[PDB]
Amino acid sequence: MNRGALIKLVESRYVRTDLPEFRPGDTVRVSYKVKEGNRTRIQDFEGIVIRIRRNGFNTTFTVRKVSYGVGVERIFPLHSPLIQKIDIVQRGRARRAKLYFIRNLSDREIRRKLRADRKRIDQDRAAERAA
CB of 11 or CB of 109, closer to RNA: 109
Residue 98 as a binder of RNA (CB under 7 A): the answer is no
Residue 5: name its binding partner from Mg ion, RNA, none (Cβ under 5 to 8 Å by kind). Mg ion
Residue 14 CA: distances (Å) to CA of 2, 35, 57, 67, 99? 20, 21, 8, 32, 29
The amino acid present at 46, given as its one-letter code, is: E
- Those residues with Cβ within 8 angstroms of residue 28's Cβ, 6 or more apart along the chain or in another chain: 22, 46, 47, 48, 49, 63, 86, 87, 88, 89
Residue 119 as a binder of RNA (CB under 7 A): the answer is yes
Stretch that binds RNA, among 3-11, 33-41, 68-76, 113-121 (CB under 7 A): 113-121
Stretch that binds RNA, among 24-32, 51-59, 67-75, 105-113 (CB under 7 A): 105-113
Residue 88 as a binder of RNA (CB under 7 A): the answer is no
Residue 121: name its binding partner from RNA, Mg ion, none (Cβ under 5 to 8 Å by kind). RNA
Residue 11: name its binding partner from Mg ion, RNA, none (Cβ under 5 to 8 Å by kind). none
Q: Least Å distance between CB 122 and RNA? A: 5
Give which of 53, 50, 80 is closest to 65, Cα–Cα.
50
Give which of 47, 44, 30, 33 is closest to 90, Cα–Cα.
47
Question: d(Cα 54, Cα 86) in Å, to the nearest integer?
Answer: 18
Residue 107 as a binder of RNA (CB under 7 A): the answer is yes
Site residues (vs Mg ion, CB under 5 A): 4-5
